[model samples]
Target chain A: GTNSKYITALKRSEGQLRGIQKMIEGDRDCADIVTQLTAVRSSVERVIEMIITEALTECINQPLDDSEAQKERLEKAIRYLIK
Target chain B: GTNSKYITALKRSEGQLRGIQKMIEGDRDCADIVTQLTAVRSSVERVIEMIITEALTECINQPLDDSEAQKERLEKAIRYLIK
Candidate 1:
């Protein structure tokens, strides 16, 4: 199952961005809006990094009669985040 | 015909990430690495938003009978970033 931690963060981040758009239309301080935008970016990356960490932990649990295939699968698991 | 502004940010961001990987290996401070990571995320999303803005601008110039299609295309463009 996908991790709840990551899913929850993603949902929260999604909601936050919608607010950001409204903030921009009101022409708030440039610095203020920029910082808010930067904060969203930080929140998102933080969420993904944890998700990728769990992916690696799962990779370690993989059985490996075929070592190359196991290695390939592990790479695929984290590809969505990094690649 | 793509916007060079977005394209350049993406390419530059890719290089910065490779540097980030190296910094992690060298055991950078948690706060420092995190700030750096956050900056990278900010850079990427900032880049995509600009690209999406361009897509909407292009949509305005699209020919008749394809107006709906133009709207459809602009939505598709930002979908990758937000959705």
Candidate 2:
């Protein structure tokens, strides 16, 4: 599951979040900054999508047979997403 | 000049190169990794293209009245690109 860790997605989201925060702090001259901020938000959304997709892929490919355990993990992910 | 810095692009390329190096060290089971690596390479190439475009934009918009200085900067960038 180490390889399945969405490191890039996580890092990208963190970087984008930091970038947006910096933009908010700086003098906003170009309207393109707004456009870029919107793009970063969309990118973060896509990261969430990728995380869910990764979870589902793992579940289908390596189903633990113990439905209860699988359900528990899935519920945890769902709660995380909800939060 | 500070506002025009391509910090994100440089950081992204560095991250991707590190990721590729890590993959090479680890057990490579997934063909998807290769696909992703290819994507990263293409992303790096686009970064170079963006750098060139930025340089051209700067040259045209903020031309140093001294042609010699402008030519020196362009030549330096071209040498960087060649390397």
Top-lDDT candidate index: 1
Error of 2 at B22 (Å): 16
Q: Calculate DockQ per candidate and list them.
A: 0.06, 0.03
Residues A1-83 of candidate 1: C-alpha lDDT, one tens digit per residue: 23344444545555555555555455454345455666667775775477457656756685577999998876776564465
Q: After superposition, how far is residue B66 of candidate 2 from its true place, in Å?
A: 1.7
Q: On a 0 to 100 scale, what is the lDDT of residue A14 in model 2? A: 46
Q: Lowest-lDDT window of 10 residues in candidate 2 chain A?
A: A27-36
RMSD of each: 15.0, 13.8
In Å, residue B16's CA in model 1 sits off its true spot by 24
Which residue runs does candidate 1 get wrong by more than 4 Å? A1-3, A71-83, B1-44, B47-83
Worst 10 residues of 1 chain B by lDDT: B1-10
| Candidate 2 C-alpha lDDT tens digits along A24-57 | 3463422344445445445544544564566556
Q: Chain B alone, TM-score of each model?
A: 0.71, 0.57
